[PDB]
Paper text:
In GviPBS, the “3 + 2” core extends to the sides with additional PC (αβ)6 hexamers (Rx1/Rx1′) that lie coaxially with the C/C′ (αβ)6 hexamers of AP and support the rods. Glr2806 is responsible for attaching Rx to the core. Its long N-terminal arm interacts with the A/A′ and C/C′ cylinders, while its REP1 domain binds inside the Rx1/Rx1′ cavity. Although mass spectrometry could not cover the entire Glr2806 sequence, our data unequivocally confirm Glr2806’s role in attaching Rx structures to the core. Consistent with the mutagenesis data, we hypothesize that there are up to three Rx hexamers on each side of the core. Furthermore, the coaxial position of PC hexamers Rx1/Rx1′ with C/C′ core cylinders brings several PCBs of those PC hexamers to distances of 27 to 31 Å from AP bilins. This is expected to substantially facilitate EET and indicates the special relevance of C/C′ hexamers (a hallmark feature of the pentacylindrical cores) in receiving energy from rods and auxiliary PC hexamers in GviPBS. A high similarity of PBS-related proteins between [name], G. morelensis, and G. kilaueensis suggests that all of them have similar, bundle-shaped PBS architectures, yet differences in the domain structure of, e.g., Glr2806 linker proteins in [name] and G. kilaueensis, indicate that the number of the core-associated Rx structures may differ. Because the Rx belt encircles the cores of the bundle-shaped PBS, one may expect varying efficiency of PBS stacking in the plasma membrane in [name] and G. kilaueensis.
Residue numbers in the entry:
A (entry chain X): 61 to 263
B (entry chain C), D (entry chain G), F (entry chain K), G (entry chain A), H (entry chain I): 1 to 162
C (entry chain L), E (entry chain H), I (entry chain J): 1 to 172
Write the structure that this text describes.
């Protein structure tokens, strides 16, 4: 009958960390015969996740790509790959940043997690230098992790902040360094510019 | 800012490759055009006060009601804001001429333009009428390749407003 | 990942030398005791559900607070997470026992675990107590496997003990 | 194939944008270079038979062992394959000159080069020696901007082999 | 992607031959007319919004059906889609005019378009009429002197016409 | 480093599962092979000085030109680096025997091999000739399952160079 | 479209759950509001002809220039298109009242509105003036909860135009 | 089905790599264990009828209530389904012994077990009771490494039910 | 994936029966010959690069057309792709030989291959000829490994041959 002394509520930890909207992140799936209302939801979700809650002006919207998604010519997975290869992505996350910062940005944006070890950095830095940017971006989208979790119709969502099967222990603290909050973003447009949140020293 | 030079460098970096003759040829094209672009930029800068005042008056001639009371053209603050805005447009056009790309115009004016204009109830048609006035006067001032450069940057704005 | 053999090679490489006969002899001894090691790993895997259950029962009897309202193992969502964590730690201890080296335990399980718990507000000392309770159950199974040839397994039991102890010390 | 023209068009398409002055300036740079590049291409084409013969002989002089029996240089089929390969290199260089990009060289020669050369046990050093011989002879044939164009495409190959 | 130069190279490669002097001459002529070509491409880009608007106004006056309820350009979502399509086709025609080859138009814009329209229930003949209306407007702008040195641009105009015509024939 | 033991543990960890009889059977295979692998490793270590000397001499016999002046084989420093490299190969072969996987060879030698050899102009063929020399001499030293183990690790290197 | 019923079903489907009391309570809220919403819809339908006529005249009074020659208000075709557009707005408002959501308004009017208005140079302010006229007249016709429902859908349009 | 052999091949395929000595050593472990595993499998097959009969009776003794009317143990169909289910378990255990992995058990029994058992209200404790009875009888029949193999597959089931 | 053991179980399961003594006998024989099988798998992997190279040289001597301009093995990009394909097929045949079943070969390599080749325009009969040339080289290595104990490997050679033959028949 008597309560626990400490006595936090369930969700207290999430409340305290500010991960309460993403710890169990909602999953948005594009469904067949989707309404126009339904498609707009998916697009919003994509832009938020893939571009790191940075603002996209109406001039920057892709439009032709969305034409395909509405048609069914492409899947959510293909759409995500077009956005990641686009100059919208490249300008923010790639051109100003270093590779170290770019790689971890890609994990957060596309996989929804933090890099688990310095070997992931080593692999993706190596790919870029041998095969350039597009091959790199393809790796994340064409990976068992991507394919098993999201597959084709699910928009990527935040997987960190919950235990994933091959996760290292460093994975949850690293997601905390990557997450600024609901109002956070990963924006190039800052005083310091794009810097590495997750050092090599950390990995 | 998008310029010929930044764009070639960006492409090379994406491929992770040293710049090749393909990129350097493009770069050469920018540097050759620069003489005509500079000539345009100097002329627009020299006539900028007169260009702006005529541009603003043309908007008031085309839309007489603005000047009438209870309307956006009425009052000194409103009229001053007009001259400020057209001056911004000229400034970013001359910047684009010198930069060798539309990037200055794109980053300063084009991004967010539609949202800003909606919120403040600023009609794209007023700006377009001013730019068209400028285009006519520039045509008198410049000829040939200078003129071509000028006209292209003014046209870019007009299409973005449209 | 690292195992006992891999660790010896890495050391010799830094010296830039062929493995010495003494180093070879140590490795041969590991191979000689490998059947016992396999039996120990089997004992943990075969009794894994019982190990966790017995630990959990003891933990919640010792610390009534966790299961009371507001406790860290209350309600069902949290209780489920607690049981999941115990199973993960046991898994990694078993991995380390096959490897003969604690690195897999350190690199994947232990590093950042304490930080995670502190951020969550999970009580680290209780987590450590859970690992000690699991250790006692597990070691019992290793010490009394069924139908196995009678022998001295004490060195392997001590090695298992150290892996549990490392985990506890990291978490706390 | 990557050329100045295809690259600007591809960029515009990726952004889903009409071609603007930035792109057209790059395009102009290709068309200005074209006169020197065409002159280079004609000289390489006219002397291609002699260029290949000398290049192959240079390889045999630089590596005398190849000519000895049981070696890759020995025998008619092997020697014929040499002349064929050097001719390919020249042909794709002239194509790149006329195309206004390295794209012809990239698609036909550079892609897959390392894997193919490994499997067939073809040394990069033989090719490099032949290309350098050509570069010296071209230097006699061409001067100024034609020479600069020629040298760039020969150097691209040399670096890819290296 | 392919351009007129690249197309000639590909043909010569299949023959395994150095480009012929006649082939070279054709390419040299393309370089000679390149300034005029750049002017034409500029004219389309500079007047792009006007071209689409003028076409759209004419289309909806000609075919009241599309804008009525039950029409394909009703309601605003459909009308917006229609205007988007017109802009895309014009974009690709302009690309083709710079390239000097219709491939970019054919490979990206045109391929599968008729099938898509038929599935949607969009009337292909109306789409084709829109492309023809755009053509007449666009050709006028290239034809206008516009403070550009006066010359004969007839070949460029004819080439532009063919690209429009290809698009219309594919859709129809 | 890939070994039988690390690979079974990695599989289990990926699925997030306890090690089962499937894994333990695999592990038993590594520990049974170990006695033959150790015997091979001891023999390679005992004759490693002689194996290296003969291997280096074989390279010079197979490619006589190297020894001539201005060539990679010529000079003390060059010859010393040859002996160093072959020694490295032997060392990583013995390590792979003891580790129970190709992982030591893979991480130390095979990764980056092609890029290093290209930059320093080191021919894969010289190494292959040396490894083949060793393989013949090992065949004299070892028999049966030790010999089989040795041959597999030498073959792995030869294929990686190839 | 978006209605209370479709939205609760969509939520349940996303979580992959059967509809629970939470959803059914929401649904009951829609069915209770229906009586007020129907009354509003009938009143707007009865006066729709008069509402549109007055709304169009109001626009002409608020912006006298439009009626002058060479302007959008001038001519029968233009005036007819005005009456058509305002009538559409009323029709989609009554649909939204009956549907129990803004979904009919969203799918027919709001989606694509900005792009259409830009291309055809139709000012949002003319529509907003007409809607505000209707809102005043509706206020006379309806009272209480019917009036509240009506006002909300008219306001939704005004905000979307704004 | 997961077996030692399929798992090594799957790993190789994932890396896109040829099978190496690391994989072949694992494979050797499977083939050596096969002698003990076959002996276990033959013994379980020979005594399968007796093992099942005793297991079913043990469940009825351990939970006397089941046999009482209105309970799941009562009645011929129910008793028949019990014997069928225990027989399935034994069959998949012998399959796993022969296959050299837990894969047969995993694919046929373990996947979907919890959902099926919930829907049909089948207690894991009844199965666990039967398996433990079998384990005791097998212990009488087999000794040494055969016994160890048998025990591992019965234990896998017990943990999955637990 | 499937292996020889797994295949027998699946059959017995469909009958819903304990494996028959006859079925068991076949499996026992597979275990008895497993050492020879391991040697054969080793022979292919150890000589894999040579097998592909030797095949490639023979193929291009037989079919000069493929390497000329217009051929499917011209230019370097295509030649590289051809060599990649040969290596993939050999990999899967070696996997099948370890498994003792061709299913892995069929499901991962062979399924869809003919359709892919027809779309590409790759000549399937030449691909099949390449697989036959690889087979002759590979079988030679299996037949003559160095320092293996002398024995009859004929059944293993035949089994290898069938996997090569399956691949060839599927491709063409
Ligand atoms: C060579 C002169 C010296 C040297 C180099 C060296 N570097 C690494 C590892 C890395 N180097 C980088 C560098 C970059 N990151 C970037 O984003 C950029 C610019 C875009 C660069 C240049 C990175 C990311 C790594 C780490 C990841 C990786 O290894 O791929 C090493 C390897 C060290 C290790 O232990 O991993 C080395 C050796 N080292 C010397 O000794 C030279 C003097
Ligand atoms: C001139 C054609 C007409 C006119 C214009 C006018 N503008 C405003 C207000 C704003 N104008 C801008 C425009 C810009 N801000 C920028 O940063 C840039 C790019 C560099 C531009 C071109 C902005 C943002 C505002 C709104 C906020 C502000 O006050 O600065 C007004 C006042 C509208 C108001 O009530 O806020 C007016 C009237 N004036 C005329 O008389 C012409 C009709
Ligand atoms: C059980 C003995 C104790 C307990 C556990 C508990 N843990 C969590 C939450 C998490 N646990 C982990 C831990 C891991 N992640 C890893 O990477 C590893 C090994 C590599 C482990 C062991 C993680 C990441 C979480 C957060 C994600 C999640 O919740 O799934 C909780 C829940 C905390 C919350 O409020 O959500 C609990 C309760 N708590 C106790 O009371 C025991 C002492
Ligand atoms: C120590 C934890 C307890 C113990 C172990 C023990 N085991 C053996 C002997 C063997 N162990 C096995 C078992 C395996 N070999 C494998 O391949 C696998 C996985 C597939 C297992 C589980 C084998 C083969 C043997 C040898 C044959 C035999 O049955 O004797 C011993 C004897 C000494 C030795 O290992 O050589 C012992 C002591 N027994 C105890 O008393 C401890 C409590
Ligand atoms: C000349 C410096 C030396 C030499 C060369 C030689 N080359 C080959 C074989 C090939 N060379 C190529 C190269 C190309 N094929 C292409 O498609 C392109 C790009 C358009 C190139 C540059 C290829 C692919 C082959 C292999 C296939 C074939 O035979 O056609 C050989 C024979 C290689 C062999 O052993 O099979 C030789 C010898 N010959 C000399 O005398 C010089 C040392
Ligand atoms: C306007 C002249 C005519 C018209 C057009 C119209 N189009 C659609 C829908 C689509 N149109 C396209 C076409 C393209 N997508 C592309 O990416 C390209 C280039 C490769 C084109 C040209 C697509 C894919 C769609 C479907 C997806 C979408 O709706 O955006 C519509 C909408 C029809 C509907 O019911 O959804 C319309 C109305 N219709 C007319 O009546 C005009 C004659
Ligand atoms: C044909 C569509 C119409 C026409 C064209 C025309 N243009 C020129 C000359 C030039 N045009 C340009 C234009 C550009 N060069 C560039 O670099 C760019 C993009 C940055 C453009 C738009 C230039 C540089 C010239 C040369 C200088 C000059 O002004 O003469 C001519 C003259 C012939 C020529 O090819 O130079 C003509 C005929 N003329 C018409 O009347 C057509 C309606
Ligand atoms: C021997 C067959 C021939 C020869 C060899 C030689 N090697 C080098 C230089 C290097 N060799 C290596 C090789 C390794 N370094 C490593 O880290 C490893 C893995 C553990 C190996 C196998 C490297 C990296 C170098 C280059 C850098 C260095 O100097 O260490 C040279 C000199 C190369 C140069 O261009 O100066 C030589 C000559 N010498 C002979 O006589 C044979 C023909
Ligand atoms: C009335 C306030 C003013 C006016 C309006 C007017 N409208 C148009 C043209 C269009 N109106 C619409 C709007 C709709 N179409 C729909 O499908 C819907 C939703 C179901 C609406 C509300 C559209 C799309 C058009 C353009 C296409 C068409 O002609 O049908 C015009 C003509 C615009 C032109 O310049 O071509 C006018 C004038 N007329 C007046 O008198 C007021 C100033
Ligand atoms: C025996 C311990 C007790 C008992 C059992 C009993 N079982 C069922 C029904 C099912 N049993 C299974 C189990 C399996 N089906 C499979 O495919 C496999 C894996 C190969 C197993 C192990 C299934 C799925 C059923 C349900 C479908 C069916 O009816 O066939 C019943 C009847 C279920 C019911 O709800 O009526 C019973 C009673 N009977 C006893 O006496 C013991 C208590
Ligand atoms: C070599 C014997 C012959 C040859 C080969 C060749 N193949 C391609 C292209 C492809 N080949 C494949 C085949 C596979 N990919 C796989 O993953 C597998 C296993 C499932 C196989 C066997 C595929 C998918 C392609 C297409 C995409 C790609 O290139 O990777 C080519 C290139 C085709 C072209 O002309 O572009 C060639 C040349 N052709 C010959 O001449 C040989 C007889
Ligand atoms: C057939 C391809 C040729 C052949 C084979 C052959 N092999 C053996 C004997 C053995 N084969 C091995 C080899 C391995 N076992 C493993 O676990 C591994 C990977 C780690 C290998 C490569 C072993 C252990 C033996 C047994 C011991 C021995 O060395 O004799 C034989 C002998 C009889 C048998 O059935 O095992 C034979 C016949 N011999 C030929 O002549 C063919 C060309």
């Amino acid at each position: 009958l008597r309560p626990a002394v400490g006595g936090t509520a369930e969700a207290a930890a999430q409340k305290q960390l500010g991960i309460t909207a993403v710890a169990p992140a909602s999953v948005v799936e594009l469904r067949p015969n989707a309404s126009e209302e339904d498609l707009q939801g998916v697009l919003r979700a994509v832009y938020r996740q893939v571009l790191g809650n940075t603002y996209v002006m109406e001039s920057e919207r892709p439009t032709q790509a969305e034409s395909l998604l509405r048609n069914g010519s492409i899947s959510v997975r293909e759409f995500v790959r077009r956005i990641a290869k686009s100059d919208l992505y490249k300008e923010r996350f790639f051109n100003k940043a270093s590779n170290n910062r770019f790689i971890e940005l890609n994990f957060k944006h596309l996989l929804g997690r933090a890099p688990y070890n310095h070997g992931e950095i080593q692999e993706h830095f190596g790919l870029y230098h041998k095969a350039g940017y597009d091959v790199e971006i393809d790796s994340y989208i064409d990976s068992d992790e991507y394919i098993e979790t999201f597959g084709e119709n699910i928009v990527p969502y935040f997987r960190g902040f919950k235990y994933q099967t091959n996760q290292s222990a460093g994975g949850f603290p690293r997601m905390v360094k990557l997450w600024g909050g609901d109002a956070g973003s990963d924006t190039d447009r800052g005083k310091n510019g794009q810097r590495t949140l997750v050092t090599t020293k950390d990995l | 800012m998008k310029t010929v030079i930044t764009e070639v460098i960006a492409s090379a970096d994406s491929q992770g490759r040293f710049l090749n003759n393909t990129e350097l040829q493009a770069a050469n094209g920018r540097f050759q055009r620069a003489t005509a672009s500079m000539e345009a930029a100097r002329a627009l800068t020299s006539n900028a006060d007169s260009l702006v005042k005529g541009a603003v008056q043309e908007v008031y001639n085309k839309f007489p009601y603005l000047t009438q009371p209870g309307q956006m053209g009425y009052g000194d603050t409103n009229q001053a804001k007009c001259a400020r805005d057209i001056s911004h447009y000229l400034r970013f056009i001359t910047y684009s001429l010198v930069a060798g790309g539309t990037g200055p115009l794109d980053d300063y004016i084009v991004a967010g333009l539609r949202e800003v204009n909606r919120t403040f109830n600023l009609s794209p048609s007023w700006y377009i009428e001013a730019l068209k006035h400028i285009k006519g006067k520039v045509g008198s001032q410049l000829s040939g390749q200078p003129l071509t450069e000028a006209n292209a940057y003014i046209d870019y704005c007009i299409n973005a407003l449209s | 990942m690292q195992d006992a053999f891999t660790k010896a090679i890495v050391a010799a490489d830094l010296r830039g030398s062929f493995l010495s006969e003494q180093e070879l002899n140590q490795l041969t001894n590991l191979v000689k005791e490998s059947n016992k090691r396999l039996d120990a790993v089997n004992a943990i895997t075969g009794n894994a559900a019982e190990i966790i259950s017995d630990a959990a029962h003891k933990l919640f009897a010792e610390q009534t607070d966790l299961i009371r309202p507001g406790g860290n193992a209350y309600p069902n969502r949290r209780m489920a997470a607690c049981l999941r964590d115990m199973e993960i730690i046991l898994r990694y201890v078993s991995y380390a026992l096959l490897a003969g080296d604690a690195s897999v335990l350190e690199d994947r399980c232990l590093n950042g675990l304490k930080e995670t718990y502190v951020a969550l507000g999970t009580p680290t000392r209780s987590v450590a107590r859970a690992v000690q309770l699991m250790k006692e159950t597990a070691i019992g199974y290793v010490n009394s496997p069924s139908g196995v040839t009678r022998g001295d397994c004490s060195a392997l039991v001590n090695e298992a003990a150290t892996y549990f102890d490392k985990a506890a010390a990291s978490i706390a």
